[PDB]
Design a protein around this nucleic acid. Structure first.
Ligand SMILES: [Mg+2]
Ligand SMILES: [Mg+2]
Ligand SMILES: [Mg+2]
Ligand SMILES: [Mg+2]
Ligand SMILES: [Zn+2]
Lengths: 136, 141, 94, 38
RNA sequence: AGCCAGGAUGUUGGCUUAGAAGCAGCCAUCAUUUAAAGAAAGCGUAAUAGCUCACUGGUCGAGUCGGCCUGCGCGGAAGA
C-alpha cells in the first residue's frame, strides 16, 4: 500500500485538480493503462488494481506503477462540530488528470496485457484506456 | 470395421489371465465370461510368452460367448522391460529422468505385424519414438 | 514513398489551430536547412493512418505543398493526451 | 432467470435478443444463462 | 451462414493412477495415416463411452467479419 515513508508536513490544502496529465507515454514497458478521466486514485485502489493485474499474468512479465499517492486526506468523524482544527489524515490519494499513464507492463503477449489491464480498471474510479508504446 | 458392436480393453498382463483384483466383475457381463478369458485368451497367450500387456476385441451379437482375434501390445509397455524404468514419470520434466537411443525399440516395434501407420517403416518407426517421451526421457537418436 | 499533401497555413495561434483540429485537419511545421520554416496544415486521417507504420518515423517522407515537394523526416510529434489522435508534427528539412 | 444491469453471453450457445425494449439472453444449452434487463 | 461427410494414428497416452481410456489428477505438448482432425472442444459413463465441436472435403453462389473517429437514442431507474 503506497504512501510517503516520510513528509515535510502532515497535512495538505484541498487544492484543485485542473489541467492535463504529465506522464503521458508508455515509457518503461510495452503496454500501459491510461487515465481518460479526472479523479483521485487511492492507495487501496492503486493496490486493488495492481493485485488484479498481477494475478492475471501469474508470475510473469514486469509491472511499473507510474502513479504514487503522496496526497494526505483528512476527515472529521461522526459527532463533531465544524471547526476546532483540521481533521486527522485517514488516507492518501494520487491526483489524476486526463492523460496519465497509470500502470505499464511488459514481458507478456498483448492480449494478456489487455486482459490484465481490463481487470484492474474495474477496480478504478476513473475511465481508462489501453495504450501501446510508440516510436517518438 | 463396420460400426458399433461390443469391444473393450481393461487388463494387466498376458501372464495374469482372467484376473479378479485388477478387474474382476468388469471382464464379462454382456456376452463375455469371467471364466472364458482363457479358452480364446490362451488360444495363443502361453505359446509365445507371459510378460506383455495387451487388450483385445469382443465382437458379440447374441452368440453365447464372443469372437475376438487378438493382436499387439502397446509401446509404453516395452519401456519397462527393454528400455528403462518400470515406473516411468518420476518427475517427468524436472530433470531428464531416464534415457533411450535410436537402436532401442526400433526392432521392439518394427515387429508389429498387426498394426502401425505409413508404408515407410522409417516413419512408423519414429511413431513409437514418442511413446518414449510422454514420460520425458532423452534423445540419443 | 510516404507522400503527405499539405496547404501552408494562412493563420497561426491557439485559436486558429483549435479551429483546425475541429475540422479534422491538424497543424505541423517544417524547419531545418537555410529556408524559413513553413507552417503547414495536414489532413488528420491520412497522416494518422500513415504513422501507424513504423517506417514513417525512420524513412524520409515527402511533403507536397503547392505542387512543390519538400523531403523531410519526422522530428517530434505531439499526440492527443488520451485519444488516438495527432495534435502537431515537427518535420526536419532533410 | 437472472436479472441485472450487465448481461452477457456466458457461452457459445448464449444468444442476445431484444424483446420489447429489453435486452435478454437466451441460451439453448443452459437455463442458468437466461438473463434479463441490462 | 446453413446443410451432407469426415473428425483419425503412436494412443486405452507414460503418469505421487484403488479405476481415467482426453477429463479435478500427472507432467510435459511430442509424433505417425491424411482433405484435415486437438496426449485436446463437452454435456458427460463402473470403465468401455454413445453423441455435437476446433480443423478439412463437398454443396451452395456473392458478399462477409469486427476494431477505430463520431451524432442521436436504450437498459441500469424503488416512496409514501
Ligand atoms: Mg481563447
Ligand atoms: Mg410480453
Ligand atoms: Mg461455409
Ligand atoms: Mg442512459
Ligand atoms: Zn449459455
Amino acid at each position: 500500500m503506497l504512501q510517503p515513508k516520510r513528509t515535510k508536513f502532515r497535512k495538505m490544502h484541498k487544492g484543485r485538480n485542473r489541467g492535463l496529465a504529465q506522464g503521458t507515454d508508455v515509457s518503461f514497458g510495452s503496454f500501459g493503462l491510461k487515465a481518460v478521466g479526472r479523479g483521485r486514485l487511492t492507495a487501496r485502489q492503486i493496490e486493488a488494481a495492481r493485485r488484479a493485474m498481477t494475478r492475471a499474468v501469474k508470475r510473469q512479465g514486469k509491472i511499473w506503477i507510474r502513479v504514487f499517492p503522496d496526497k494526505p486526506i483528512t476527515e472529521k468523524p461522526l459527532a463533531v462540530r465544524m471547526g476546532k482544527g483540521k481533521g486527522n489524515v485517514e488516507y492518501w490519494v494520487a491526483l489524476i488528470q486526463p492523460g496519465k499513464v497509470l500502470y505499464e507492463m511488459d514481458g507478456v503477449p498483448e492480449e494478456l496485457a489487455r486482459e490484465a489491464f481490463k481487470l484492474a480498471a474495474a477496480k478504478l474510479p476513473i475511465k481508462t484506456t489501453f495504450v501501446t508504446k510508440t516510436v517518438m | 470395421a463396420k460400426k458399433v458392436q461390443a469391444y473393450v480393453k481393461l487388463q494387466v498382463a498376458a501372464g495374469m489371465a482372467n484376473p479378479s483384483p485388477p478387474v474382476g466383475p468388469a471382464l464379462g457381463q454382456q456376452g463375455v465370461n469371467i471364466m472364458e478369458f482363457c479358452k480364446a485368451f490362451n488360444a495363443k497367450t502361453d505359446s509365445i510368452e507371459k510378460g506383455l500387456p495387451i487388450p483385445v476385441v469382443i465382437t458379440v451379437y447374441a452368440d453365447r460367448s464372443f469372437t475376438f482375434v487378438t493382436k499387439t501390445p502397446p509401446a509404453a509397455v516395452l519401456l519397462k522391460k527393454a528400455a528403462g524404468i518400470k515406473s516411468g514419470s518420476g518427475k517427468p520434466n524436472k530433470d531428464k529422468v531416464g534415457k533411450i537411443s535410436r537402436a532401442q525399440l526400433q526392432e521392439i516395434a518394427q515387429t508389429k505385424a498387426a498394426d502401425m501407420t505409413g508404408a515407410d517403416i522409417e516413419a512408423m518407426t519414429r511413431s513409437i519414438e514418442g511413446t518414449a517421451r510422454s514420460m520425458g526421457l532423452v534423445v540419443e537418436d | 514513398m510516404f507522400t503527405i499533401n499539405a496547404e501552408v497555413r494562412k493563420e497561426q495561434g491557439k485559436g486558429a489551430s483549435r479551429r483546425l483540429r475541429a475540422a479534422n485537419k491538424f497543424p505541423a511545421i517544417i524547419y531545418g536547412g537555410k529556408e524559413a520554416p513553413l507552417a503547414i496544415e495536414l489532413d488528420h486521417d491520412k497522416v494518422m493512418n500513415m504513422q501507424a507504420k513504423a517506417e514513417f518515423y525512420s524513412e524520409v517522407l515527402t511533403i507536397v505543398v503547392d505542387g512543390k515537394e519538400i523531403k523531410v523526416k519526422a522530428q517530434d510529434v505531439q499526440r492527443h493526451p488520451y485519444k488516438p489522435k495527432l495534435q502537431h508534427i515537427d518535420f526536419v528539412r532533410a | 432467470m437472472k436479472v441485472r444491469a450487465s448481461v452477457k453471453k456466458l457461452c457459445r450457445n448464449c444468444k442476445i435478443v431484444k424483446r420489447d425494449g429489453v435486452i435478454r439472453v437466451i441460451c439453448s444449452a443452459e437455463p442458468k444463462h437466461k438473463q434479463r434487463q441490462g
